[PDB]
Amino acid sequence: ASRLYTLVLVLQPQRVLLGMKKRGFGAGRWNGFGGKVQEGETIEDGARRELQEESGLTVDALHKVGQIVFEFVGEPELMDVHVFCTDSIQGTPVESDEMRPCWFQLDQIPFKDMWPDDSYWFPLLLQKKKFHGYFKFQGQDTILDYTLREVDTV
Numbered sequence: 001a002s003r004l005y006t007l008v009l010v011l012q013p014q015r016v017l018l019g020m021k022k023r024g025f026g027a028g029r030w031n032g033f034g035g036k037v038q039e040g041e042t043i044e045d046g047a048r049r050e051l052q053e054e055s056g057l058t059v060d061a062l063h064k065v066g067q068i069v070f071e072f073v074g075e076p077e078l079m080d081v082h083v084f085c086t087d088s089i090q091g092t093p094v095e096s097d098e099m100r101p102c103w104f105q106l107d108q109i110p111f112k113d114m115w116p117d118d119s120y121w122f123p124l125l126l127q128k129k130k131f132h133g134y135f136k137f138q139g140q141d142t143i144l145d146y147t148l149r150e151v152d153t154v
Contacts, residue, residue: 005082007034010085010089014106017104030113031099033047047082056092062086069133070136124148132148
């Protein structure tokens with residue numbers, strides 16, 4: 001059994017948008033935008049909804065770029081995260097109660113203050129490659145096992 005999650009990475013030719021999670025899950029780290037997928041909305045709609053609730057941004061078109069499964073030791077539900085990307089955005093990223101948005105240069109991505117798994121799949125994202133990933137976590141710091149491959153269909 002798994003639970004559906006969204007992850008939105010605003011990727012521009014020379015910069016990427018990340019948000020400092022101010023609390024809850026993943027707080028203290030720079031994150032993409034997203035959240036739980038609710039009942040009554042599609043996965044993409046949930047990604048749009050959370051992107052607006054967390055940054056105030058709306059997007060014309062979202063592109064599927066990957067899917068990452070996360071296992072946390074002791075927790076029954078696996079986390080099925082659908083990763084999205086976009087270049088065209090509508091509006092200006094403003095601070096919400098959850099995220100503090102900020103632009104980063106592609107050669108200055110703060111991996112040391114992001115989820116440890118990002119250092120693995122981010123190179124694939126920047127290369128415009130589609131990918132499937134799996135990460136088993138013990139706590140929020142230690143990766144026990146992981147798989148990562150390039151795909152043609154997300």
